[PDB]
């Protein structure tokens, strides 16, 4: 009964630990000793985008590398043109408590969500010349923490109730559900080829999910506190986590264990966001000490600092062509670096 | 040339700069309380108008917004506590049911001792005030707290004991004033009390931003 199953679970955990131990024949901290350092990286602000009336909580770059969308605590979305700094759209929401954004790959729709347990989908191309709500998805129990499009027809969301869901937009019903976490889920990230995804959920644990089959495949552990950010390495077989104990880490999906940790003794504050550069050589991280750090992914050293915001950096993103960086903070400004 | 994009952007800025004036007058108050604290009756007797509920009203030409978190408040997570722009927190706590005081105390010392609410003052409404009087004249308050010193059948002693027991839970008392009141079914002066406490909070803030101490 219960005791035999528990014993078998313990035996399998011992097997997993032994299999992970037996594969550690080398490390990046030694193999990467033949890599020339990237040197000192220096960046300057090109544009400053003004107009939000409160804290900024999310952003997402478009797929043409020119338009972007952001959401604020006063309950608004703004769609910006960044080459000229012109505002293209300003969308007012139904409730001021918003926490996430997404921008569709084709450019026809956007989405948002928050403490109302509902995900709203807006249509940007109508014959009447306005923006109207196309769909409202309801059925979650906790608040909404992240949302990412797959195409014009399907979406995937994560909640603060230990669940994730894949939805078909046309009918509005949950096509599949993913369960297994114990605490609230903070963030998820999609694969480049759009077949799998990863999520981190306040257990200091991360899980890898298959979209269509609907089960968890791998589980990674090692942090000491909540995981607040996650993203994929460009070729889709690695990912990086940022947590609330002032530490980032790198995981590989095939070796099933950790490779490097990124942390320095002068940081005593947690992470808010991570992202990679186009070739995978730089890792950008945002902190609660008002600055952003640019790390060398392979040697685990500090290559640069971005400073100029006066409050916490909460949002951070890199374009699809790789020619700019955008940061958003609690002082209600967006900045573009290049 | 197609530079009408710039003119369109200027038109959008003309509306943002209009709403910026209204977003600097509104006063936000976060409402908390127990399950049996008469919360529904308290709010429904003020003549005002599931995720989050919001209520709007006006006192002396000042707009007040009351934000009610209906049972989602049990979350012990920092990211859920994104209510740090509020002017004050308003607790409704019962005192007539002597077996429910420990729960309210444990809720209170859990909320007040949090960091994120260091810049917000706190108001405390001891509720119904009369079933407590009936209990005192029939039963003694020593049967639950073996810490009271005084007359078990005097209402004043009970009131001071409860108020001091609540005030003893907080630390760093001087950060922001803590007010308390006794209300039964008044419903008509509650606006006066909340207005006065918020006004005193703003006055203390001004005495400090102007470098007067």
């Amino acid at each position, epitope marked *: 009964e219960l005791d035999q199953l528990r014993q078998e679970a313990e035996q399998l955990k011992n097997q997993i630990r032994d299999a992970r131990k037996a594969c550690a024949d080398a490390t990046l901290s030694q193999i990467t000793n033949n890599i020339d350092p990237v040197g000192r990286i220096q960046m300057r602000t090109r544009r400053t985008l003004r107009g939000h009336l409160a804290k900024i909580y999310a952003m997402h770059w478009g797929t043409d590398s020119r338009l972007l969308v952001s959401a604020s605590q006063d309950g608004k979305l703004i769609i910006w043109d960044s080459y000229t700094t*012109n505002k293209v759209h300003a969308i007012p929401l139904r409730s001021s408590w918003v926490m996430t954004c997404a921008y569709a790959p084709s450019g026809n729709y956007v989405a948002c969500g928050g403490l109302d347990n509902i995900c709203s989908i807006y249509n940007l191309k109508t014959r009447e010349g306005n923006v109207r709500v196309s769909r409202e998805l309801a059925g979650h129990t906790g608040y909404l923490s992240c949302c990412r499009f797959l195409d014009d027809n399907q979406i995937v969301t994560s909640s603060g109730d230990t669940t994730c869901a894949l939805w078909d937009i046309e009918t509005g019903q949950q096509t599949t559900t993913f369960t297994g976490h114990t605490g609230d889920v903070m963030s998820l990230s999609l694969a480049p080829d759009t077949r799998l995804f990863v999520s981190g959920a306040c257990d200091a644990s991360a899980k890898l999910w298959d979209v269509r089959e609907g089960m968890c495949r791998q589980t990674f552990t090692g942090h000491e506190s909540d995981i607040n950010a996650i993203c994929f390495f460009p070729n889709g077989n690695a990912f990086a986590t940022g947590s609330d104990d002032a530490t980032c880490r790198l995981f590989d999906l095939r070796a099933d264990q950790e490779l490097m940790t990124y942390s320095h003794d002068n940081i005593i504050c947690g992470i808010t966001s991570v992202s990679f550069s186009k070739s995978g050589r730089l890792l950008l991280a945002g902190y609660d000490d008002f600055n952003c750090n640019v790390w060398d992914a392979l040697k685990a050293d500090r290559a640069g600092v971005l400073a100029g915001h006066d409050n916490r950096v909460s949002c951070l993103g890199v374009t699809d062509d790789g020619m700019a960086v955008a940061t958003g903070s609690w002082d209600s400004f967006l900045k573009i670096w290049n | 040339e197609d530079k009408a*994009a710039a003119e369109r952007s200027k038109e959008i800025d003309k509306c943002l700069s209009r709403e910026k004036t209204y977003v600097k007058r509104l006063v936000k108050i976060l409402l908390l309380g127990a399950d049996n604290s008469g919360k529904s009756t308290f709010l429904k007797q003020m003549r005002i108008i599931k995720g989050i509920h919001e209520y709007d009203f006006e006192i002396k030409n000042v707009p007040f917004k009351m934000v009610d978190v209906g049972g989602q408040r049990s979350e012990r997570k920092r990211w859920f506590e994104c209510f740090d722009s509020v002017t004050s927190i308003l607790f409704l706590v019962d005192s007539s049911d002597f077996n429910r005081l420990t729960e309210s105390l444990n809720d209170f010392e859990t909320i007040v001792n949090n960091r994120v609410f260091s810049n917000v003052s706190i108001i405390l409404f001891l509720n119904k005030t009369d079933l407590l009087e009936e209990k005192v004249q029939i039963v003694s308050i020593k049967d639950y707290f073996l810490e009271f010193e005084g007359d078990p059948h005097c209402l004043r002693d009970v009131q001071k004991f409860l108020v001091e027991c609540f005030r003893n839970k907080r630390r760093d008392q001087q950060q922001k004033p803590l007010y308390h009141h006794f209300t039964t079914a008044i419903n008509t002066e509650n606006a006066r009390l909340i207005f006065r406490d918020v006004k005193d909070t703003i006055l203390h803030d001004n005495l400090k931003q102007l470098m007067l101490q």
Partner: single-chain antibody
Amino acid sequence: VQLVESGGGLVQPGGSRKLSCSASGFAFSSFGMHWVRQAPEKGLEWVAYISSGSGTIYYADTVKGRFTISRDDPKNTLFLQMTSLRSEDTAMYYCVRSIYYYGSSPFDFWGQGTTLTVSSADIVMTQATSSVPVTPGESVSISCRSSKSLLHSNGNTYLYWFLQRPGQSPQLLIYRMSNLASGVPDRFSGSGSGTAFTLTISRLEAEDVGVYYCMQHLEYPLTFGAGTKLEL
């Protein structure tokens, strides 16, 4: 979406007239509006422009000081007040819709127009021909030329192609020299380079005959071409 015009008829030399236009089915206060004109047996000619928020107003060279454009948003109405009429003002007048932001499609809906009868450093655009006999199932091309280069330093080429069928208002085919409009079948194409542009129609079908026009939108005033007719 619908735009309906009123105010036409017969007028004596001198005198005055007022034309009005009523819009229904869209957000009138977010669009800019044009008044365009067509002589009885000639091509199209542009008359006036009013912007959103009533900030900018433009007139043609041969109408300044006599014509006035105005709009009313809480009733969705547009007015053209016109005075001191000559015999050269006899024409059919259309009202046109246009919205400008990054990636939009101007000139994409025309009204039905009204008839009014009365008792240079500009860019020049030239059509190749006045008529081209065609047969169904063929592939045909049209071309037009300009006196300047329409390519700007930001990467856009401002050439527009419209088609007018017998008895109907014009319709947008191509905007900014390469792009298709909504609802236009993908058998139309257009390309070229500075000072030489060509439109290609593949597999001609019925109800695809009429007159074709090319227009520029680089600087005001906006000017039209002479017109190419296809006969089946």
